[PDB]
Amino acid sequence: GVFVFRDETSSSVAPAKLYKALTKDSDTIAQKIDGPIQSIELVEGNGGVGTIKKITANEGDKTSFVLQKVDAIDEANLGYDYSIVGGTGLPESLEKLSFETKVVAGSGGGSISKVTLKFHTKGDAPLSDAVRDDALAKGAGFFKAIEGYVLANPAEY
């Protein structure tokens, strides 16, 4: 089955800048900062729809990876969708985790980051809170890492 969860996050970062950092510069920033992500490599494509990326990261003291697919890109409306489709980093009860994101004008020149997660469980397995919350936690952690990088480097943004 499909489980949907929507969330919004405000930021002082201007829309155009945030969108660029999250969708075009994130792979580069993630390997640059001291976070969980250790390496990102293109398995297929170079960024456009259909692209498959292998992301290797450290979960505690162990390494795992996920395969990521680029579902859609609407640069005109600052939209970007993609999903995690495999790898050892993907919970056993999950078949696919899809993200639908959009950046809109926020308050005081800042923006609003809207995200819709869609959990596709394996064999209609139930979605435990633990699995759902861990994904939200990782999604929130990654977002803050990029936003934080943007805020700390005004010459670049």
Q: Does 129 bind its own copies (CB under 8 A)?
A: yes
Using the CB atoms, write b or e for 52-73: b if 16+ within 10 Å: ebbbbbeeeeeeebbbbbbbee
The rounded distance, in Å, linking the Cα atoms of 69 and 85 is: 7
| Piece of the chain touching ligand 2AN by CB under 6 A; list 14-22, 63-71, 72-80, 101-109 | 63-71
55 in Cβ contact with 38 (< 8 Å) = no
Choose which of 23, 27, 36, 121 interacts with its own copies (CB under 8 A): 36
| Piece of the chain touching ligand 2AN by CB under 6 A; list 16-24, 55-63, 72-80, 100-108 | 55-63
Q: Does 64 bind ligand 2AN (CB under 6 A)?
A: yes
The rounded distance, in Å, linking the Cα atoms of 3 and 24 is: 28
Choose which of 59, 75, 133, 156 interacts with ligand 2AN (CB under 6 A): 59
| Piece of the chain touching ligand 2AN by CB under 6 A; list 17-25, 72-80, 102-110, 147-155 | 147-155
Task: Determine which helix (DSSP H) or strand (DSSP E) holds 84, and give its type and residue range.
Answer: strand 79-86
